[PDB]
Amino acid sequence: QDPRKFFPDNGFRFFDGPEDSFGDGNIPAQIILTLTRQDEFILKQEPVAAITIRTNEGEMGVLAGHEYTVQQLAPGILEVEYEGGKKDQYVISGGFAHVNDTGVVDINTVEAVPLEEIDHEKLAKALEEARAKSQSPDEAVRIQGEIALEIFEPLEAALH
Amino acid sequence: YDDLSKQAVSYRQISLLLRRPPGREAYPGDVFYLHSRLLERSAMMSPQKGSGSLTSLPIVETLSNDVTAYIVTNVISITDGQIYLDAKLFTGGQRPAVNIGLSVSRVGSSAQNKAMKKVGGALKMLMGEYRKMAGEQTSGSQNVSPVMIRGARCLQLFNQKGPSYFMDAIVALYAVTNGYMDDVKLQYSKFYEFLLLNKDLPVLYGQVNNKYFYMYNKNLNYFIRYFGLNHEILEPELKKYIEIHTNLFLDNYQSRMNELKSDEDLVQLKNLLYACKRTV
Amino acid sequence: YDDLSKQAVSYRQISLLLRRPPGREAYPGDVFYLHSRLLERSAMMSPQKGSGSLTSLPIVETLSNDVTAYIVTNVISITDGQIYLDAKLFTGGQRPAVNIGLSVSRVGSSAQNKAMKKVGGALKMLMGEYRKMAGEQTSG
Amino acid sequence: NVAMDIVEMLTKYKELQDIIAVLGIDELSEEDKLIVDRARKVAKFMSQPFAVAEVFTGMKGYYVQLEDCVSDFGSLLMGQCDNIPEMAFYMVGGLDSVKEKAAKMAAEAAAMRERARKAAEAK
Amino acid sequence: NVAMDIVEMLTKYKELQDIIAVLGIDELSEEDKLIVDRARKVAKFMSQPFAVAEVFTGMKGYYVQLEDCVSDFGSLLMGQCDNIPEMAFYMVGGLDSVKEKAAKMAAEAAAMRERARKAAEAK
Amino acid sequence: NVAMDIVEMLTKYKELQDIIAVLGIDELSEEDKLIVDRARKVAKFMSQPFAVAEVFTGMKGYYVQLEDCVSDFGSLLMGQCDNIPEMAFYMVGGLDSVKEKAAKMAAEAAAMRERARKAAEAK
Amino acid sequence: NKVKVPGRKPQDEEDLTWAEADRKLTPEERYARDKQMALLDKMTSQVEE
Amino acid sequence: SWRDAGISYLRYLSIVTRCIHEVQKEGPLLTKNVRFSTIGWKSLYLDHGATKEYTAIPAELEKIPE
Amino acid sequence: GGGTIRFWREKLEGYKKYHQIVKTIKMVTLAKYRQTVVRTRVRDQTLRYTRKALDAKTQDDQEVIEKSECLLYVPITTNRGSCGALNTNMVRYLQEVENPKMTIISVGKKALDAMTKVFQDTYRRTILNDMKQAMSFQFAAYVLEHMNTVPWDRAQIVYNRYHGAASQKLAIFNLPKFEDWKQKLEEDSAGDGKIEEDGLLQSLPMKTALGELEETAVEDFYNFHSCLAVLNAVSENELSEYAARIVAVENQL
């Protein structure tokens, strides 16, 4: 019998992740931001001046050389500020954000869509639907109302 | 009539050497009339003429399983039916290699027996249904249709070497069509038949409640032939022979068979079933 | 002519019974010449000849869509085009059941009218594409 | 129109054995599977037992009238009988004989179902 | 009985040629491709060298005795030898000669790997 | 040697033509897309006019010699005429004749730019 | 344990395939049966309801 | 809350994603994203010869595995 | 040769038919391939960081079987064929690796018939995504919910890696167990951070910071990153399915 014809590669290797160095020098001026939805990215290592995230603990701000920290993202919106003073906002559905000491932010989410692609019109109808589900006493429907409200309330407040 | 093609080569030889004009495939042309003269002499004669008869089993050799040669078509035209033997099936294991899709008989029930009408009419239905499914490599091993079971066991029973006595043939086919032989596996379909016909189990294991119906006597053929199996006096005794045969088989013999793991014993059991396929 | 395939059977009958030498499909040699004696009499005559014309629509029955047959081979070699009808389309509600690829008119446009050249020239540029698409697309 | 529509249907039916043999039935649209079943039902329905074939078929022949022979194809042509199974059309005459046969096959199926249950109850 | 089963196996392999020639062995059931991998072995085993054709096959000729001809087919038929590859049966006589040849091929094939290791390390 | 190189080129272009319709020209390497350009240039350069039809279609015909033709294809093969566009080789004869057409095309496009620039700047 | 291939021999599994049957028409037959049984199973329900 | 209800964090994120795909505007982006929320898959296990749906973990998100 | 000429007529017309039907597979396959090649431009970024957590040195097989009690394998197979040796090599690797303490939950119909016939009892079930809609994060989570039925120690996901249109090799994700991974996290976070295998990324600051993170959130961390791993496997195998089918179909033509 043939001794192990196959030798499959470790699929993790094809990626090129950061090498977290404890730092023997200065900090960059701008964070290298990478943001990813399900499989495809929207931003691949783009220079960015600062970024503001929403969390369960609350809302946080990230600058160059920010402390290495990791925590859950709460389902809401996200704000990104590039070096040119402009801004770009993205609705998300949870995820994890990793900020490197070198200034390389890797964000992984299940969804990412700008605010421009959402209308308050269609958003308004789903609100009272979620409220009726929340008020309808049923463990299978109450939570659905609560969760849809969790993502809609920051949008209703952000568009306004 | 062993090969009639060889009777046509001779007529060709004669006619061509006597300077008759050839024809298709170098035959003279009136070689149809030849076999026509020969074969229309077969008949079942009127009672005015004695109620005599002569059956004819002409044989025609075939090349590469074609039915497009001249003499072959000339004879299929004449003969009532045909027993087409396919080398793909002879070579594929089964003997006699009858191909049922191409073999028919233009008389049918009127020829065969009262007791065989009701079984053959069931086998035609069963094989017509199995013909549509048997191409499928069996996937629903437990979800297999009953037709996929009965048909395959019947194909095992079709495997013979020598002739089978009428009493000894039906009782093997009745079990199939009525599903007594469904718990056994395909490969043991003939050993079953052997015991069903030559080693009466209930006579051996004491389960004798049947008054008469046993396969040892061999004189029930005439009662079966006259009364039929689907008759009040023979149906229940028949079932109360076969269900006991099945239970004794499934319990004492089948059980021991599936417990064999060695190669010596399995090769011994192997050759036994081939012998059962020949003698039965 | 409805039809020439039977006319050739008649020439075969005559020639064989009068012991003329046979050939392919038991026909003689000059059975190509038989139909050339005939179809070439079709013409579009000259203005010195009244400008009259004799058109021909010879019918020839095929068998199992064979065109390698002797007579079909011959008449195709003679004719100024052909039309090819198909039973697989006749049954599918397509009547007249042409097969436009096998059907040919070497007289492409010189026959057509001013109003017809543009239209049919667009239809060629429509159906040649319709087949490349219809052939590759699924049933569904 | 019914006749030419059936001819037109069986043409496509041939073109779809040519595909199902290769790909599978799953590679066809639901609208295409429909005419597959209809052509497969017309092919089996246009069968008929004959009084002369009592020897071979083992069943009595049926005389089908012309008027009855159009309201049964045309019904099957426009999906009026798609709920009826396939084999109910096999070797029968008109459409009235079908529902008799289909009602039977339902009964002889319920028998094996409940007998399987009683087989489970016994053992 | 052995010959009957050999001929049967090849009767199935021939039917599967019409698929393998078209699609490939990868489109066959596990049972089917086992029969393929076994019928190929039988066919390659049927081959053997003769003392006359030594000029061509470049091998000495074997004389397979009858009793040793059946046990080999029976082992190859009952799946008693499936770990052996297909090519060990080509142009041999007797299963003992196979197992010798299979050792030869295993040795040479592994030696290519140690050799390629040295060719890679020196490179 | 020139002709055999053209046969190699156009053969490779047929293969890459079977790839472009599947993958896309961007899938091809930098070496392959160069011959995908030159093969198209060659095939367009085979297109020749005819003095026979000079009255019908209007364009002149070109009787091109043998040796001159080989130097032409050798230029298009050695890459020393690659800056010239594709359509300039369409319906011409001789490398000395296409360059007038290339100049004509460039002059025409430059006149269209000089027309558009001043027609847009005047308003 | 490798594969219990079907064969004429008893140790091998049961082969319910028939050489006379054609593989080309088998897929349509499978769809036909699987649909026909759905209609009968539903007909039982319709009669009960 | 939904935590002790028994559902997973991943079903939670997918619920949020479904809602986001609802409210967003009609266009090519929505054409892409409705695909990433629609449920069409299944599960099957092989009986002795037949196929059977392993219905112990449903695809829909309102239900709870048991 | 009347029967013979009609025989060859039938075969000839049957293959002229069969050819264009297979070509139809080809065109439909490219319609589904060009949609997915867009991923190639946008490839290899969602697990760029995730490796750093779930990656370790290449551990031998014979040792982990002794460490573990019930391993797990997830081969990602297809729903329709004419693909190639992807499914079959995926089976060959498992019989190459087969051992007592394994279990298989596959994906696709083609591991349904094959595995049960080769692996009788270890194989349990599969998952089937009719590819009318693209694959979702919720689908990979739905796969995690099946794997979580088992108290498995190491889950080797197996799939096909689209290196190019002409090469679709194998690739695996060796996922440790959560209760094992958390202990490895603490053990490695204590000592000094030295890479134990070439080509591996250092991850000491991460395994400290995750230690700062709460309990439920780290549970979600593991489940989330494993879901992304699963999803990348499914996506790579879809592209490899539609990339190997065109090859294994043009050879049929």
Residue numbers in the entry:
A (entry chain H): 17 to 176
B (entry chain C): 283 to 562
C (entry chain A): 283 to 422
D (entry chain D), E (entry chain F), F (entry chain E): 379 to 501
G (entry chain N): 20 to 68
H (entry chain I): 2 to 67
I (entry chain G): 3 to 255
What text does the study give?
The translocation of protons through the membrane-bound Fo part, mediated by subunit a, drives the rotation of a membrane-embedded c-ring and the attached central stalk, which together form the rotor. To reveal how the mitochondrial ATP synthase is modulated by lipids and organised into a dimer shaping discoid cristae in Euglenozoan mitochondria, we determined the structure of the ATP synthase dimer from E. gracilis.
Symmetry expansion of the pseudo-C2-symmetric dimer particles was used to classify individual F1/c-ring monomers into rotational states 1, 2 and 3 and resolve structures at 3.0- to 3.9 Å resolution. Subsequent focused classification of the IF1 binding site suggested complete inhibitor binding for rotational states 1 and 2, whereas rotational state 3 displayed a mixed occupancy, with a minority (34%) of particles containing IF1 and a majority (66%) not containing the inhibitor. In all three rotational states, IF1 is bound to the βDP-αDP interface adopting a similar conformation. While E. gracilis IF1 shares the conserved C-terminal helix at the βDP-αDP interface, including an EERY consensus motif, it does not contain the N-terminal helix. This results in interactions with the C-terminal domain of the αDP-subunit via a number of residues that are conserved in Euglenozoa. As a consequence, the E. gracilis IF1, extends around the C-terminal domain of the αDP-subunit and exits the F1 through the βTP-αDP interface in close proximity of the γ-protrusion of the central stalk. Consequently, the N-terminus of the E. gracilis IF1 does not contact the central α-helical coiled coil of the central stalk, indicating a different binding mode compared to the mammalian inhibitor.
